[PDB]
Amino acid sequence: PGGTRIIYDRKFLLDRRNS
Amino acid sequence: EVANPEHYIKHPLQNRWALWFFKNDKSKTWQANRLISKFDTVEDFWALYNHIQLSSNLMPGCDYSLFKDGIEPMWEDEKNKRGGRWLITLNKQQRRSDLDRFWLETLLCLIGESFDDYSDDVCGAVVNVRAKGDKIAIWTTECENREAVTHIGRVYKERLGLPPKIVIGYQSHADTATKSGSTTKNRFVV
Numbered sequence: 001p002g003g004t005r006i007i008y009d010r011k012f013l014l015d016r017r018n019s
Numbered sequence: 020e021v022a023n024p025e026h027y028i029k030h031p032l033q034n035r036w037a038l039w040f041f042k043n044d045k046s047k048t049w050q051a052n053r054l055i056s057k058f059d060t061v062e063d064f065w066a067l068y069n070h071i072q073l074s075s076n077l078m079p080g081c082d083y084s085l086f087k088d089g090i091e092p093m094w095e096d097e098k099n100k101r102g103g104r105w106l107i108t109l110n111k112q113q114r115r116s117d118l119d120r121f122w123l124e125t126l127l128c129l130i131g132e133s134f135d136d137y138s139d140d141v142c143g144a145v146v147n148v149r150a151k152g153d154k155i156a157i158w159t160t161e162c163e164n165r166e167a168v169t170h171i172g173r174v175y176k177e178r179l180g181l182p183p184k185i186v187i188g189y190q191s192h193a194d195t196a197t198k199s200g201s202t203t204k205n206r207f208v209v
């Protein structure tokens with residue numbers, strides 16, 4: 001508990017597949 | 020003079036990951052059959068992903084493993100010996116329809132830290148390409164951490180989007196059969 005974890009939703013990741 | 024990060028900085032991942040490949044030689048020791056590369060940003064993940072063979076294009080008997088940097092994709096590792104895995108068993112037909120997208124979703128779950136705090140229990144995932152049926156599994160560090168293990172399994176099954184009625188099981192590594200099958204049981208199910 002406690003900690004600024006870097007979290008990415010699938011949409012965010014997929015939108016940069018080719019970027 | 021302060022450039023805007025969003026314009027030129029790569030999107031960092033919570034963890035640095037390492038991709039491994041396994042080529043069955045039948046003769047050599049399992050361990051003797053290798054690291055591909057590592058990455059710790061979204062852009063670098065895709066650059067690697069986009070130039071390697073899709074799991075469904077690999078020869079039967081090969082594996083792809085994505086584990087947090089420092090954790091070898093084997094039972095003996097400090098972070099896996101007391102752990103286990105959520106196993107996804109695919110039929111032969113699913114090689115065409117679900118293998119590749121299931122593996123990609125697994126990857127996105129890992130690097131994206133999709134299990135919230137319980138993501139710290141995640142070690143990695145492995146996909147086995149086999150003629151009798153492909154398998155995908157997410158390995159966790161401690162088989163006794165019910166809260167973490169059950170939540171991970173639940174979110175994982177949801178993310179894959181397979182029929183909710185289908186049940187998957189979690190087996191600890193220290194319990195793998197050592198005889199000829201000796202009933203390999205599940206500690207948890209979701």
Ligand SMILES: C[n+]1cn([C@@H]2O[C@H](COP(=O)(O)OP(=O)(O)OP(=O)(O)O)[C@@H](O)[C@H]2O)c2nc(N)[nH]c(=O)c21
Binds near residue numbers: 049
């Ligand atoms: C993940 N893993 C697999 N092996 C070896 O690889 C064999 C195959 O294990 P497998 O997980 O690759 O499934 P496979 O479909 O090939 O075979 P099956 O399910 O028993 O039909 C094991 O029985 C071990 O001999 C392993 N051997 C060691 N020492 N350590 C590991 O972490 C490890």
